[PDB]
Assembly symmetry: D2
Homo-oligomer: 448 residues x 4
């Protein structure tokens, strides 16, 4: 396999864009996390007083186990792969590897029967996946989304006071500012971004079918529910007390849906930026002094990848949350694809950041449009009329706007014919589209 | 239109099952909520000291406005429909109606210019829909889901101690209890049910494009952001400070996804109950004394409706969250269908409740299966072996289980050949599949 | 139920837009088609020589049965509903109704035991639904799509020669004509429209589980496969020889996917028209002589409804095509919603037709844009250079276009500096953006 | 990149299962097909009499071009990648490569200006993708589906006469045969499999925006529509005369939907096989002589991958079929993922084939169930009653079946109490559930 011959663009065309996820989602990562889980389980038994058959671990034993995790590499992963030759269960190959390693330590040599003690394969797998999700989000996904938010915020702040014609149903409307329109997207991102950071990833640890049966058979006297809760919560996960063989994956569905919400806001953003480029509101920043068009390719690339990511995330939320009776195995193969969904998202985020850095505001395009659309002041005139209790204020302005092409002159002429205080007239005669932006700039400044 | 000739089964075949939603989602409801919003806006202006042009409302005026809402009916809705003849905007027809009504009150007669003051149609619509969603969830949806949860919980409690063979990949596995398997579903429902109750429905109120432009044109001196925040929050909604013409609908997406999560757990439930019926684990409760099969039709009906509801909820979350620039109108028609999605859910909930009430446990079916599958004790033997540091405990039991058809006799014989303490042997020889349920019943009792 | 209180906008806000579908999809329609199917089955037995126990029907008997179908009304539907009080199966209520009616005819009085002979409920239901689909498509859906195609074609023909600036990635590109851009959509619609017309709707008729078991028990000597094939094919349907209790619904999936393909082309159309309106390329046709903006609301309404229709059609294709073993009943409730999906489509088609009729071309907007974008001729210059074997033709024009703002003057100046035949220069100096439309108009004229 | 560190299981865990697709979908494949398209275009110009500026190619020139395609390798792909350093468009790098190669041939040296003559990048890309799709389907996908169909057919034929209890709504029903139930799936696969083989993949070739503008600028006298039609149809593709810059991708949507239809039938199959395994109807074929359970893992793996494939195929059909105006670029990145969808399908097909080969019928399980469910003969008794005009035949059998547990004895006793011919009684008294399979075996034998 080379990136040239890869079928998926995640490991092919975009291989350099997605590498950050490889330590979390890959056959190597899954092996690393299963190994970590098996060792940490064994350690939890050594740490428990009511399980005297596993003695407390001494300095040298702790370090040996610690070193298995920090020294884990391709070579060692291949060794575990070697053991898969013998087993029905991949997870069993990790137990075999550990049995092998325990021989190298005087104290551990003796304790091999307690590796994977009372566990089912899914006890190990669900924890491994819970940790992969938790860490991919904490180290890669949440920080990247934070960066995109900062990027759009910076653009919003910079263009806080840049007046702009609105378009509602595609057509000239009450003005805003470019920075306000940009800040609106960051405001939408805040809630699901915080939700993404805060979700504790669910995990269970309770034997074959969720009832600690084998645990209780061997150690009726150990408080297994307490032991397993403390084990799982020690890893920074959300202990699920109530499961079958599998953790039911509703937490994966929740995380998938948070990602969908984020991706859809960003989808909306890429489509609006593309429109602003189309209108010439942005040009390329970088003959050196001459204005040039910016190619919106990065936003179009993000747009395509955001949809692919959602396709998979939506599927996960729907499919993983049914499993026949105490479970069917059809979720296993699907879980190997969590990384693919996050990868399409990540590629999209990188594209948004890259496109954002190309944008330079084109003030003259924005000003041309405002100066051609004086009709957008009509509501200002109408609302001032209302204040002074003028009856048919809306109909009157509709009669005006539909009967002539409005500019400064006709507006002034209409205003004078109104029965409103002279000061009120004067203020309306000062109004221009570029100065009818309401609280747009104030809202941008207030935004954090 | 009669229910016989309706195209949608929501207003046809299932008309009686869905009526509870009509006061929240229907052209009548939308009119009622727009009217309420317009009146409450007008009242907020009267209540504001910095807007002296609308005087504080006296006893009689408050009651008149109050009465417009409580006395609203088909007759009045038809009257508003009458005004739609004149207008581009449906919401405008409500203003016309109110202009008409204000004539009937000495004080209100004078204040007609302040109805819909500085508002855009979408200010009224988004609030109306926010309230419809909020109240449909608070009065109908959340309580119905609470009822389904209670129903499954009661079944779980009743069958807490009823031993049952598990099936993993469809095949005999470590035992559980029927009540434990039922409680697992309620445990999954807890989190999204609480999330459904807690979501404050987003709403905005800020003029044509989100910047209070018309407000500021007429009243530069009024703190509009404060006024509008207090207005929206007074209604029990989540004020959105940052919008275009529309509220961006990410809250609708969040609510839709919570509903999807709930529906998927219930989808899983209907499919498992169907399987338990298929296995004869349940029979009909209601020749009077003779056992009869229960027809799983109610669970199959729920299954079909849960999928339809999700189809729409998924669509809402994806489609409503993009809108071109300061908005396109394609969301309007889509919002008229929120009730349809909730209706498919509601029909499904009613079906689950109805099916649940038909289930009677069939103990002999459950016992037959346990007594035929002694192989499921193997892990108990293995894990006891591990405790006493016996080396190849897993391989030994695999060699046993794959070479003979296991019953009590072969098991006893194998156990005796083990090198474990005599007391350990004795306890394993007491074990039976129906008594190998681990902490299933303890977990059911602990469940709330 | 009134349209005001309906939850679904299909039977509410849009009740008048969707009535054409009521005779095909409604509880009344389903009853009508079940009745028709039961009668036509009974007639097929009378018509079979090897079934002498049902005598050939005489003039009076044929007319009596014929009249049951043509005289079917609300009153009669209510009577069948009356019998549902007694039955597990709705279809059984139709048999009871017919038993009742057969008493009114001397010959039929005697043959009541042969109503629903050897049938299962699903034999009747699948045929009823097959006919509802077949006829809704033949009478309503396919003709409406044909009308939309004609509408867009007429617009295309009218604007065949109207030069227009293209936009690729939102930005000025090689010109086309408005009519060519419109005709492109009709070209896409041709194939799935023909496919929609040609699909023969699958139907089966073979007893409880697909094997004619009950038929063969009573009449081992009758060729049931031949009888049932001829019965189903006589109705204009596609006989499925191989089924369980249900027809497996892959034909419904195929039809749903054809509808999805059509709806997506029309979705693309509504979005482009909205953009052309936004650019001012269209204005309202209908102060009388003054240009006015067209509001794109009809296209936005179509856009929203097309997505809703696809949401349901996609769901049907995925969900209806699994059914557990010899069937589960969860498809039943889902089938009652086929009409809802077609209804969202129909509302969208009506909206497209209505919007199309508002469009008037705005030539000056189109001409302004062409005259401002002479850079789009660059490829013409380059390709003429290639013809005369000029080496770096692309790089040279990129060097030109990126270094100055191109107009007629700079272009002429550049052209003269080329080493190409004098006649070649002269033809390029004649070129203008509005005259660089290639074969756009020729392709429009050729289109049918 | 190694398979261990790949994020996608397509190029990771399942790398060996998916390699067949690499020559069709990979950055290498895309380069190969772009190169082939560019060369074949150039050849089409040489072959055209009205384009004398490109002379007819001589033996040596044809072979040189031919050799570029057959000798294409990683080395050459890397060389094209080298040129991407200089270009905005990847396709341009192929032109540069060819310019380079043309130097090595006396005749071709002279014709470099005609490489990519009048083409746009998308002319090359859409053809390249059309060929990749066409060939992946013809060489890999359609033959693999053919193999799965044969596999299920063989199982159906082998078990043609093996009586089996049906289950409708999970519950005992009229018998069938195992082979009939299997053949039902192959019958469903026939139509979409033939449709998959027959679809001619759409492709266009017409310059920047679909109008041959640049072609006509340089060669007004050449019949470009005829030339390009013949070019595209010579490649075994479906010429699209009517496009913008892109081929509109409705053919990709059609192919995606055919794949969805196939995958859903196979999804249904994997779920039923899993149920038959659960019931013990199948055991493992391979202590040597003792019956052992078959683990349904291969069917569960297929189930998971079929859903992933559909997620992507559904997305393609919806998203690729809109593109803003004369096109946006967001489809480009999405097209790089066509292979991923086909790969999930292929992995699933391999799993189905692999699971099928493990199944051995377990006759005693099937016979036990039939012999315990004599109630399923009731409809036979009822239908024989109907034949001899017995009035309440259905109600009578319901009264029987609901009042006692039916076996051979009660049935015989009931039959004797009927007023039907003595021969009719005798034949019903011979009936047993295992002999009430109707035309199941006859239908299996007839199946091809």
């Amino acid at each position: 396999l080379t990136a040239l011959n890869a079928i998926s663009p995640i490991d092919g065309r975009y291989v350099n864009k997605t590498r950050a996820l490889s330590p979390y989602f890959s056959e190597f990562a899954l092996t690393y996390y299963r190994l970590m889980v098996e060792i940490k389980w064994f350690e939890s038994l050594a740490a428990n007083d009511t399980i005297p058959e596993v003695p407390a671990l001494d300095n040298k034993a702790r370090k040996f186990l610690s070193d298995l995790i920090s020294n884990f590499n391709e070579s060692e992963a291949e060794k575990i792969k070697e053991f898969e030759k013998q087993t029905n269960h991949d997870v069993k190959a990790v137990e075999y590897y550990l049995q092998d390693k325990f021989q190298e330590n005087e104290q551990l040599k003796s304790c091999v029967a307690f590796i994977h003690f009372a566990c089912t394969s899914e006890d190990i797998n669900n924890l491994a996946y819970a940790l992969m999700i938790k860490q991919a989000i904490a180290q890669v996904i949440q920080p990247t989304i934070a960066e995109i938010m900062g990027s759009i915020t910076l653009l919003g702040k910079q263009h806080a006071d840049v007046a702009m014609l609105s378009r509602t149903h595609g057509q000239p409307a009450t003005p805003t500012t470019m920075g306000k329109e940009l800040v609106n997207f960051v405001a939408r991102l805040k809630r699901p971004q915080q939700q993404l950071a805060e979700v504790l990833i669910p995990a269970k640890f309770n034997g074959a079918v969720g009832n600690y049966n084998a645990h209780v058979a061997a150690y009726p006297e150990v408080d297994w529910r307490k032991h397993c809760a403390n084990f799982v919560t020690s890893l920074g996960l959300s202990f699920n007390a109530y499961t079958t063989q599998i953790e039911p994956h509703d937490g994966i569905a929740e995380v998938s849906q948070i990602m969908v919400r984020i991706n859809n806001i960003l989808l909306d953003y890429t489509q609006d930026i593309w429109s602003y480029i189309s209108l010439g509101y942005f040009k390329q920043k970088t003959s050196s002094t001459m204005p040039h068009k910016v190619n919106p390719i990065d936003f179009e690339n993000a747009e395509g990848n955001l949809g692919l990511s959602n396709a998979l995330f939506i599927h996960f939320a729907n499919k993983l949350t049914q499993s026949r009776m105490q479970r069917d195995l059809s979720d296993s193969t699907v879980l190997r694809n969590l990384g693919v969904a996050f990868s399409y998202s990540l590629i999209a985020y990188h594209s948004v950041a890259k496109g954002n850095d190309k944008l330079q505001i084109n003030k003259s395009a924005l000003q041309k449009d405002l100066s051609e659309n004086w009709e957008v002041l009509a509501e200002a005139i109408q609302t001032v009329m209302r204040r002074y209790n003028e009856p048919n204020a809306y109909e009157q302005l509709k009669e005006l706007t539909r009967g002539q092409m409005i500019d400064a002159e006709n507006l002034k002429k209409f205003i004078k014919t109104l029965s409103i205080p002279e000061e009120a007239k004067a203020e309306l005669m000062k109004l221009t589209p570029e100065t009818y932006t309401g609280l747009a700039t104030q809202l941008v400044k207030a935004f954090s």
